[PDB]
Amino acid sequence: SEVPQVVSLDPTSIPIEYNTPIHDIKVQVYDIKGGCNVEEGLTIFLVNNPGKENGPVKISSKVNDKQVSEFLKDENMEKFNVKLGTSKHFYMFNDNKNSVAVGYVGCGSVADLSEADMKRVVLSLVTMLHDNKLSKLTVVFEINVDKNLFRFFLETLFYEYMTDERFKSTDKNVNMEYIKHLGVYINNADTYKEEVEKARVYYFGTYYASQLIAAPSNYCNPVSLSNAAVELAQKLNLEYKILGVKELEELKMGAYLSVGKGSMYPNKFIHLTYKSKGDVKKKIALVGKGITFDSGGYNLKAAPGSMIDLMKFDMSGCAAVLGCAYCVGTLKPENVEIHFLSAVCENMVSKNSYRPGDIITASNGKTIEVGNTDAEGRLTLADALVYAEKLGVDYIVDIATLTGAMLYSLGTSYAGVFGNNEELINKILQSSKTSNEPVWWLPIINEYRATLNSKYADINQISSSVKASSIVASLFLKEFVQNTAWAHIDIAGVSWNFKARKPKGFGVRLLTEFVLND
Amino acid sequence: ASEVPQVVSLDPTSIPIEYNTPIHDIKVQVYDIKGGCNVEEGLTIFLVNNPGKENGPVKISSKVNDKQVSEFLKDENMEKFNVKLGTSKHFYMFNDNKNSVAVGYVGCGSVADLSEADMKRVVLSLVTMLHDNKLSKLTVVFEINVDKNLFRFFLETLFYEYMTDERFKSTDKNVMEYIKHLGVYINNADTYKEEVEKARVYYFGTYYASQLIAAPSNYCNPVSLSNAAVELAQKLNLEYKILGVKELEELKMGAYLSVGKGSMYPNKFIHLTYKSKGDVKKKIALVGKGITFDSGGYNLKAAPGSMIDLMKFDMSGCAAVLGCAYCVGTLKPENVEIHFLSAVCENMVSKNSYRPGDIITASNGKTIEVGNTDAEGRLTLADALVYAEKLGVDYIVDIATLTGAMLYSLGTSYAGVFGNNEELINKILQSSKTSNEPVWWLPIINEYRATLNSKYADINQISSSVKASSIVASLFLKEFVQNTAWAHIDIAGVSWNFKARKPKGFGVRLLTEFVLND
Amino acid sequence: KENGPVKISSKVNDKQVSEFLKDENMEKFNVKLGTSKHFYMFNDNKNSVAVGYVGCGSVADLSEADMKRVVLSLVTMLHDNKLSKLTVVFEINVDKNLFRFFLETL
Amino acid sequence: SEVPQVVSLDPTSIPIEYNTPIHDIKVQVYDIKGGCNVEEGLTIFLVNNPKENGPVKISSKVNDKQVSEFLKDENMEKFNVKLGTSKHFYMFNDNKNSVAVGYVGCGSVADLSEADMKRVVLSLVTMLHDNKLSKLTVVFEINVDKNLFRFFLETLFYEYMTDERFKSEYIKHLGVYINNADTYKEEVEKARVYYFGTYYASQLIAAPSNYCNPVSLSNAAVELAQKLNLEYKILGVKELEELKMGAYLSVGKGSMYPNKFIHLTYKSKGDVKKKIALVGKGITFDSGGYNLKAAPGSMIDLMKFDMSGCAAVLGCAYCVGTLKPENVEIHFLSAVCENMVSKNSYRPGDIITASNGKTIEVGNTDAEGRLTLADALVYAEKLGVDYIVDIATLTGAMLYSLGTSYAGVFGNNEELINKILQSSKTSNEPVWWLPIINEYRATLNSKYADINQISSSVKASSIVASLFLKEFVQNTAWAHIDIAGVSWNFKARKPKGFGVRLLTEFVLND
Amino acid sequence: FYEYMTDERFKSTDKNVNMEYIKHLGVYINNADTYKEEVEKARVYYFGTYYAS
Ligand SMILES: N[C@H](CCc1ccccc1)P(=O)(O)C[C@@H](Cc1ccccc1)C(=O)O
Ligand SMILES: N[C@H](CCc1ccccc1)P(=O)(O)C[C@@H](Cc1ccccc1)C(=O)O
Ligand SMILES: N[C@H](CCc1ccccc1)P(=O)(O)C[C@@H](Cc1ccccc1)C(=O)O
Ligand SMILES: [Zn+2]
Ligand SMILES: [Zn+2]
Ligand SMILES: [Zn+2]
């Protein structure tokens, strides 16, 4: 509970914004075939030209206004093209002689938009909402989208539009105002309508994870993070338990505790539970890596490209899991019991830190020789995994910013998934597809197992030879799940949006889809 | 006996030590080959060379008291095999008593005087014969010429290499039994019989050092290390004194204390004493470098090839000294007084650590400018040497994993010896020859002395210019021995067996031969 | 049983070698993937033959990598043999493809 | 041979000054007991205090009323004896003659080291450089070995000699006052020879690689041989190919300069009782090859010095050719080439065949020395000599093992090693015996070739390189002197000409 | 002043067994009667600099 402080100006909680301007947006969805009233604020058509690359903009929707209609006559729009991401703004007077702003975002030639295209599309739309004080946006859909994509559209629109100012003080945006109303025209209205509030929940889960990740390590430490989880659990009516050092010791979580030894913040193990009202048909343990700061320990992140300044993000996995708890706690799925777990600690350099070479004992009795204190994640997860399996769940899915190697394998767009069970991996895949958080299945190659053979301990933490460290890390983790379907999502490469200089909150939607569709 | 401080209750508070090794259960028997070879249960190995003829055929010279085995090992049957160094074969036959026997041979090359290291290759080949094969008995037949030392050496090496440290094994113990009988057939057996128990002592001394070295730095720390020394002293009836920080401060050991400042473990200075029953004719101080973990301090071991993960081994000198204490305490030499010394501490990074640039004062009043916190060994040794010489000894020999340069100079096989005294150096060199722990005499080049001229302090810890750091470290050390014959053995290169991934326990035999042949 | 004792099932048309392969002598060795032992001995013909095993672990399905480990162990015996023929007896379960891999790797 | 040229301004040879100012100096030696004359020039006393850095006190009787006052104890008490500390003053002598008088601090050390004596000779040299003098007179108020006395001389000459060849005065008389000046006279001209051999090596080393390339270097050796009446043979690529020197030729492949193998021979007049082959590493520039010297601290700019070994050997040829020892036949050898990056260079991974038929896998093109030496050693042994000594700036590791002061000696023969050590003692070029550790041999076991050039594992590269070289001497006493650490004087930014005296002493005493 | 002063606060065994400063500094300069004011300023400046040092 009580966050330790070195100086009274050290902050004692993570600032969190629950009531975002996004949440205040009154959303309306309409059937396209009833026609668009273009009345105020800004009214953007999403338009594609199926086939011809860089085609004309032709506005299909019947528009209930002679003047907007004349404006948008194919003739008038022909000069503008649809190159995905192009946008144009139009200013005119409608029927009641009321100046309206209109425009379109180019949606490309390909009539089925990829997740990445939909993103580039929202981004164009958000640059239209920035630097333009608007009370109302209206998006007319003149493209084919499935229900998940329109949900994604909204999730991304909400999340990209949002602008984290928690840490701003003298350099807040003096000229920032949010829309109060969002109008959406689409075909099949009724069907897409259900995606709206789902999107809003998904948005917040993601954004909430985002907020935790973005919170710097002085704000977001093991104590303040676990406090925030307790606060979230209380707001969602989730069962929660925070395991403190004494309990951790009793549970013999030596790998986890060893990582935290060097920190001024006592380890805190987060255990949230959501139980369905009905019969419980599926028990799931979601495990997030919760390193609130990763200095590397005595294996200090000193090497070029080690990005020590980014390491506040090493609790992204935990964030993903918490954001998911938000979503599941809000959407209240049936027939599931979900455990949200994170072995939270901070990996620091101290007289008290664990050293390279240390042999430590995991809660399952396996002794581990520490080859590198910067491979701390898998040590914390090891004990979290033993814990998860002791819960007697059907699935254990962990999500962790585990390996920098992910940048070299999948890059910044697709997370890696490893696991010991094909059905479970496929479930993650499907959840990847429906959440639009891209995940790729990577192999746990058993041949590498032998390089974890320690001369003194039961197991090495790291390989000496094998540079395929995401695989090796997975091999290591696999040793801590005895008999349960388990999957591991390495979001090290994807978690942080380097270009936008912010977290993605990656994994919240994925895990939620996973929980919801199982 | 002091409390091992702990961070968490899962932190171990002692080094686990195996005193009663399976090797102590081996009943060993030497028989003269004149008498002939009883070939029965177990495995009966011949050590055979073919003088001059490189990879020549195997010939069994010795009498075998069995028509059947004899017939089997008759020349016509043995020329399908060659004596190439370290090669081996397994034979299977039914003996004179209708009993099935396992006989074999290890090829001893073609040079009838195996060097220390060939013999190491020969043992290794024979160990592999003992591994994966539950034998109650090994019978070895020397059909090669070795001398007392070399014969011992084989026993000592065999014992050592056979033993398998499972102390840090939990779920990954090997399911591994040990021969309970060693039979040796050699010419002039009676002259060799005396080597057996000496080898067994030497083995354990070495193995004991090995145990300490291998113990990771969370297990083996200054408090637990000194506790183990106390325990060893108590078992051997040695006088002991452990100097704690208050006494160290009183003694003004600022160089030593500065190193430890950053550690959570208080410095502990180990002082063990063996005094002979008779008139004391020689007083020897053995000083071992006792850095239980060397992180490098603020000069963190972050550079490629700095091998931070190995740095539990930086107390090897202390280990060698302690193992030597075991041998001396056990073999009880006469007319000698031996002091076993190690200034034990841990070189860590902390708000309390000493910094590069700090000027610190040794117990002899010399002020030292710290140019690199990673050159900590010489600092601790400085104060240890001043202490040693205050004891009024005839010789001071320090042994220390002092400089990584040793890898560049002598490599992994031969330790470097430097000293201020030729007679003493020659004694170490003779001891090298008789212990078969290879050492090479390296110069203390006075020309380099000037690069230790600090602008502010009396002396620089490190050279700025001279890259010959083993020699520079030696020059630095020399400054702390005013008037006593002193040698320094740099075992940095040699202490860890990188290929086998284990300590060698290097120096125990060397130091014990040194002590004993005086 | 990981690192399980060796037990030869095949009947062999030799008395000496059958004796050598009995369960009592063979239980002294283990099946740790890649572990081998092998002895020279005289067969019912006073002919000089070598006999052993290569441990194939405790999994009834060998991977390619696992097979490579087995072959590598064989190939070791081979590089120190001035023998005339190799006989490999599969006391493990292998499909057509793995078997070709075994040969190609050997 | 015509050195090839990229441009009309590419030097086609190495400037060499043979007639150094140091030759026009007349050297005289007076028993100090007789007293000291102060007539002209500067007079330096070599004084020590056997009190650490204690007061100065001049011992010798001195033939000048007015200067003896300057030398009075209470005047000198103002000055100290700390190693290499000096002061000197101008004044007027007995005959109003502008004489300078001073001292050098010889520390408290009773017996001067090779090092401490350089510090004396350096302090003294400063004053020579800052002072326009006719004569310099040195007074020995300390103890010196005939060898240390000779060392004093050559160190003086050499440090005093300033190489001005690459730019766009000196005393004409040297006085020595020494206790027992009869024993020492013979050291003078020996010192002078030794000086020049060293200085000549120095000159070659210092010459940049555009000046000193394989063609110009061999040309210079030929010129030296001609001046000394030595037999000489330069092997060109056609002969090297016929001799199957593929290790050596591989290294040179990338160079615009054809390999040149220098073979000089001095044969004694009398019965030849000892045949010696001296082999010097002669890489005129070492870029590293495709293993380019790009790493921090690889000092690519220094790599003109990678023919130091060759220079040492040529300098020694000068001394031997000049001093004309008896009962020895000496072969001076260097497989000279340049290690360059080119479409024609050998690559890492190449397997090449030495002249003895051993195939070598090239693990690193920057470990080229041993490749050239291999072929040179096979050549040397074919000569049927009693000893082969190679000297080479072979391994940077030497800086980490012995540093900049002592060269490393490895060998396959104790007697020969001891001879080198004895030569080290008498030449005052410090050498230390390092082991060839056979345990490391196995890391030269190539999977494909007969042998690997480098270890993969072992970082003890001086030892590994020695193991590799050993492979190319079948049956002859052989020693290898690694002067990589010691060859260049980094502080003075010049070569030391290391090895010339060592090798000459070796030849002369054995 | 600054370059003449040796800092020995951190020696103890190192000497300095020779180092002893002049007691007198004489200067001879043109219109010295002006330069004279610079002397004590220099001494203050020296010590400020030396103190920082
Ligand atoms: N949270 C770290 C990886 C995340 C990351 C993301 C982007 C760029 C760089 C790093 P880590 O726990 O230090 C994991 C180590 C794994 C490791 C560390 C040290 C030795 C072996 C493996 C790594 O992948 O670098
Ligand atoms: N206990 C360390 C060396 C032991 C060792 C053994 C094998 C490989 C690497 C290192 P050290 O005290 O840091 C010795 C320092 C010496 C040193 C001297 C001056 C500056 C920095 C380091 C070093 O070798 O790194
Ligand atoms: N002409 C080089 C040594 C000269 C030298 C002297 C002092 C400092 C740096 C370099 P080398 O042939 O590249 C010898 C290599 C040895 C070597 C061996 C194997 C791989 C790479 C380099 C080296 O020590 O750098
Ligand atoms: Zn890490
Ligand atoms: Zn991490
Ligand atoms: Zn260190």
Ligand SMILES: [Zn+2]
């Ligand atoms: Zn150390």
Ligand SMILES: [Zn+2]
């Ligand atoms: Zn090179």
Ligand SMILES: [Zn+2]
């Ligand atoms: Zn070179």
